[PDB]
């Protein structure tokens, strides 16, 4: 990903086009975005330019929007939600704490540049 | 003639008359292709309707259809576990 | 035995917690020839209900950064707590039972780092014991 640089966005666009589903509300797109974010979160030494950071922020925003609500198209405590997967069982999407993933992505971004109520 | 069952179910009012129509349809016998159609119609109306008792009756009829000897219940099992996750 | 009533929501939550260590609070009001228990949220219906919450400050002195140290603390706690934490919060905060741990900047001093933690007495005793255990010895 680091060597490719700006090619990650083009690869993601090509993958989305190949999937024959332009709308990114599908659970597969959100899962792929989360997986891409964890890879960047794992390596904190991978510095990126302004364009790459903007693209990553846009992708994270799109993934969060998709995760918050998904289209209804068809053809001791815990937190979770519900949705309908595209041609697969809803239990197949094994994703835990997307908000924590966003927090980890923000942490990795801050780590690169050395950075009433509770929040 | 699945069309007759479909149109009769659609014309039936949701709260009360639907229960009586489903009971009357349940008492009479059914055939393999007729089962394969009415199960999907029942699932669609189960999604559409949100009353507790009606959904309970639909689940009971799903159980009755599953006991049919000649039927091949494979896809309806998948839909059953899906609605189980959603129930 | 003293006969009293319990709010349905509290009992439902208690049964859900028991099904899958946690202890339940108790708040009751003397009534006319009877006694009734009521939850904290339901007790607010008596309005007035002026809620006061304590927020003690825990001070630490270390040259390490904040976010990485927070991640290390989260890993250490989730290892010690035998995976009792299966929930997360969006702003990099981890909560156990009913105590919130979040990163907050100090008021004016840049040379010292301070965070704010709030808890009840039942959580206060456990928090004090855990902080004393941490201060006893760590790989520092």
From Swiss-Prot, chain A:
Its recorded name reads: Integrator complex subunit 10
Localization annotation: Nucleus
In which domain of life is the source organism classified? Eukaryota
Its biological purpose = Component of the integrator complex, a multiprotein complex that terminates RNA polymerase II (Pol II) transcription in the promoter-proximal region of genes.
Q: What does the organism's lineage look like at the top?
A: Eukaryota, Metazoa, Chordata, Craniata, Vertebrata
This protein's assembly is summarised as: Component of the Integrator complex, composed of core subunits INTS1, INTS2, INTS3, INTS4, INTS5, INTS6, INTS7, INTS8, INTS9/RC74, INTS10, INTS11/CPSF3L, INTS12, INTS13, INTS14 and INTS15. The core complex associates with protein phosphatase 2A subunits PPP2CA and PPP2R1A, to form the Integrator-PP2A (INTAC) complex. INTS10 is part of the tail subcomplex, composed of INTS10, INTS13, INTS14 and INTS15.
Q: Which family does it belong to?
A: Belongs to the Integrator subunit 10 family.
**What species is this protein from?**
Homo sapiens (Human)
Q: Which residues form a coiled coil?
A: none
Encoding gene (name): INTS10
Curated annotation (Swiss-Prot), chain B:
Where's it found, cell-wise? Nucleus; Cytoplasm
| Record-stated family | Belongs to the Integrator subunit 4 family.
Q: At which residues are the HEAT repeats?
A: 32-71
Q: What is its quaternary makeup?
A: Component of the Integrator complex, composed of core subunits INTS1, INTS2, INTS3, INTS4, INTS5, INTS6, INTS7, INTS8, INTS9/RC74, INTS10, INTS11/CPSF3L, INTS12, INTS13, INTS14 and INTS15. The core complex associates with protein phosphatase 2A subunits PPP2CA and PPP2R1A, to form the Integrator-PP2A (INTAC) complex. INTS4 is part of the RNA endonuclease subcomplex, composed of INTS4, INTS9, INTS11 and inositol hexakisphosphate (InsP6). Interacts with BRAT1; interaction is required for the assembly of the RNA endonuclease subcomplex.
Query: What gene is this protein a product of?
Result: INTS4
The scientific name of the source species is Homo sapiens
Q: What biological function has been recorded for the protein in this entry?
A: Component of the integrator complex, a multiprotein complex that terminates RNA polymerase II (Pol II) transcription in the promoter-proximal region of genes.
Name listed for the protein in its UniProt record: Integrator complex subunit 4
Curated annotation (Swiss-Prot), chain C:
What do the Gene Ontology cellular component annotations say? blood microparticle; cytoplasm; cytosol; INTAC complex; integrator complex; nucleoplasm; nucleus
Signal sequence span is none
Q: Does the entry annotate any disulfide bonds, and if so which pairs?
A: none
The compartments listed are: Nucleus; Cytoplasm
Its keywords, alphabetically, are: Cytoplasm, Hydrolase, Intellectual disability, Isopeptide bond, Metal-binding, Nucleus, Ubl conjugation, Zinc
Q: Report where the covalent cross-link Glycyl lysine isopeptide (Lys-Gly) (interchain with G-Cter in SUMO) sits.
A: 12
Please report the PTM annotation for this entry. Sumoylated; sumoylation regulates its subcellular location and is required for integrator complex integrity.
Per the record, the domain of life is Eukaryota
Q: Write out the GO MF terms.
A: RNA endonuclease activity
A GO BP entry? snRNA processing
What residues does 1D-myo-inositol hexakisphosphate bind to? 12
The family annotation for this protein states: Belongs to the metallo-beta-lactamase superfamily. RNA-metabolizing metallo-beta-lactamase-like family. INTS11 subfamily.
Cited function: RNA endonuclease component of the integrator complex, a multiprotein complex that terminates RNA polymerase II (Pol II) transcription in the promoter-proximal region of genes.
Subunit-structure text: Component of the Integrator complex, composed of core subunits INTS1, INTS2, INTS3, INTS4, INTS5, INTS6, INTS7, INTS8, INTS9/RC74, INTS10, INTS11/CPSF3L, INTS12, INTS13, INTS14 and INTS15. The core complex associates with protein phosphatase 2A subunits PPP2CA and PPP2R1A, to form the Integrator-PP2A (INTAC) complex. INTS11 is part of the RNA endonuclease subcomplex, composed of INTS4, INTS9, INTS11 and inositol hexakisphosphate (InsP6). Interacts with WDR73; interaction is required for the assembly of the RNA endonuclease subcomplex in the cytoplasm.
The name this protein goes by in its record: Integrator complex subunit 11
What is the source species? Answer: Homo sapiens
Please give the range of the full-length protein represented by this chain: 451 to 597 of 600
